[PDB]
């Protein structure tokens, strides 16, 4: 037969809307200093 099995961390995504914070690598108008310092090596993963 069969039974329901729950899995955690499956690669499933849905389109959604959310707040996005700033990150950047004299004082400027965009307040780039307030942006968190980005990682020197960005991680990009091919799906």
Which residues contribute to the site for other proteins (CB under 8 A)?
27, 33-34
Contacts of 2 (CB under 8 A, 6+ apart): none
Instruction: State the minimum distance, in angstroms, from the CB of residue 40 to other proteins.
Output: 22
Q: Which is nearer to other proteins, 35 or 38 (CB)?
A: 35
Q: Tell me how far apart the alpha carbons of residues 7 and 3 are, in angstroms, rounded to a whole number.
A: 13
Q: Which is nearer to other proteins, 13 or 21 (CB)?
A: 21
Q: Which is nearer to other proteins, 37 or 42 (CB)?
A: 37
φ/ψ of 23, rounded to 5, equals -145, 135
């Amino acid at each position: 037969n069969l039974w329901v099995t729950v899995y955690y961390g499956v690669p499933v995504w849905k389109d959604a809307e959310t707040t996005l914070f700033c990150a950047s690598d004299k004082h400027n108008v965009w307040a780039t200093h307030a942006c968190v310092p980005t990682d020197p090596n960005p991680q990009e993963i091919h799906l």
